[PDB]
């Protein structure tokens, strides 16, 4: 409709929310998820070695 300077005022708010999410939100959560995954799978490895 009205193409407006807001087209810029949004992009700023965009690139910020991407970076703080990247550096300070995602690794903290995925590290815990992968930790629980690996440390559940290690038990399966232990059972396999017990049988072996």
């Amino acid at each position: 409709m009205n193409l407006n300077a807001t087209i810029l005022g949004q992009a700023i708010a965009f690139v910020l929310f991407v970076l703080f999410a990247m550096k300070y939100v995602w690794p903290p959560l995925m590290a815990a998820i992968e930790k629980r995954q690996k440390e559940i799978a290690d038990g399966l490895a232990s059972a396999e070695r017990a049988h072996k």
Binding site: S46, A47, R49, A50
Partner: protein, 52 residues
């Protein structure tokens, strides 16, 4: 379950290490018996012939 596996493996390896030593000690005992009885017969038969 893995701490049961370690116990069982160590116990059975100890059993087998006892068994091997027992078997080879009795093998040396048999060797001594054979050699000493051979030494005895080596004189029994010689005395027999030299009296004949």
């Amino acid at each position: 379950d893995l701490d049961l596996a370690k116990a069982s493996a160590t116990d059975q390896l100890k059993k087998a290490k006892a068994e091997a030593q027992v078997i080879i000690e009795q093998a040396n005992k048999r060797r001594s018996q054979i050699l000493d009885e051979a030494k005895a017969e080596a004189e029994q038969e010689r005395t027999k012939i030299v009296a004949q």
